[PDB]
Amino acid sequence: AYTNSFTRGVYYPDKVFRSSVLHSTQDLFLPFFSNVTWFHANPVLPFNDGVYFASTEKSNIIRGWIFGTTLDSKTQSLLIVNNATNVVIKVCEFQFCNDPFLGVMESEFRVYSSANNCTFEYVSKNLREFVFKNIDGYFKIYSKHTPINLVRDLPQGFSALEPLVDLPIGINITRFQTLLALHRSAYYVGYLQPRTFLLKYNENGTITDAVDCALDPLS
C-alpha cells in the first residue's frame, strides 16, 4: 500500500531560538503531500538521503532499526535496539540474520550472531515519528511522540520534530531495516529531498506552521 502525508516531517534545523517571525530555510525535508510506502505486520530498504519514519501502536512491536551499507561483516554498521529495558545503541561489525527480529519466557534477540570490532557502545494509541540523517560523519536523529486517538492509521496535522541524538561515527550508510517483536504467547517510510520551506515561529519559539514553497503557485 501507499499513503499520503499531509504536512509531516518538519524538524528544527538548528539550535537557534526565534520569537514571533517567519523564517526561510533550505534543507532536506519531506515534501508536503508525498507518496509514503505502507507496511503491515520486514524488508531491506534504501537510505539514499535521510528518512522519515512513523509508527503506531500501544504495545511495542517496533523495536529499533539497523543501518549500514551491507548489514553484515566486512564493513561496519550501526545497530539501535530496545528490549523491555531501554535503548541500546551499538556500532560494531556484525553478522545480521537476513530476517532478524526478537521474540516475546520472553526470550528474544535472534537479531545478529556477531559483535566484532566494536567502535562505539551505549546502554542504559501512539504515534512515534523519527527523522534520520547522516552528514559529515554525524548521524543525526530527530523524533517526536504524539498521541493519536486512533490505533494504527496515519493521521493529519502539524507537529515539528525536536533533535534527540548526535553520533560522530564516520560510518557509511546505504541501507536500513526494522526490528519487530514476534508472536509466541503498521509503519511508513518517506524520503528527504533538498527543499526550501517557510517556518512560522511562535512567541515561545516553537514551529506552529510551515509552507512548502514548491508545491503550487500560491505557495
Ligand X SMILES: *[C@@H]1O[C@H](CO)[C@@H](O)[C@H](O)[C@H]1NC(C)=O
**Given the rule CB under 8 A, which residues bind other proteins?**
12, 15-19, 21, 136-138, 162-163, 168, 170, 204-206
User: Could you tell me the maximum CA-CA distance found in the chain, to the nearest angstrom?
Assistant: 59
Pairwise CA distance, residues 215 & 219, whole Å: 6
Pairwise CA distance, residues 158 & 130, whole Å: 14
Q: Is the CB of residue 108 less than 8 Å from the CB of residue 83?
A: yes
Report, in Å, the least distance between residue 164 CB and other proteins.
9
Pairwise CA distance, residues 80 & 92, whole Å: 11
Stretch that binds ligand X, among 48-56, 83-91, 124-132, 210-218 (CB under 6 A): 83-91
Residue 172 interacts with, from other proteins, ligand X, none (CB under 5-8 Å by kind): ligand X
Rg for the chain (alpha carbons), in Å? 18
* Interacting residues of 166 by C-beta distance below 8 A, sequence separation 6+: 138, 139, 140, 141
Instruction: Establish if 42 lies at the interface with ligand X (CB under 6 A).
Output: no
What's the full length of the chain, in residues?
219
Near ligand X in 172-191, by CB under 6 A = 172
Q: Cell triple for residue 178? A: 526494522
Pairwise CA distance, residues 177 & 11, whole Å: 22
Nearest residue (CB) to ligand X, 59 versus 85: 85
Residue 136 interacts with, from ligand X, other proteins, none (CB under 5-8 Å by kind): other proteins
Q: Which of 20, 25, 26, 116 binds ligand X (CB under 6 A)?
A: 116
Q: Which of 25, 48, 202, 219 binds ligand X (CB under 6 A)?
A: 202
Report, in Å, the least distance between residue 163 CB and other proteins.
6
Instruction: Establish if 35 lies at the interface with ligand X (CB under 6 A).
Output: yes
Q: Which residues bind ligand X (CB under 6 A)?
A: 2, 4, 35, 81, 83, 85, 88, 116-117, 123, 170, 172, 202-204
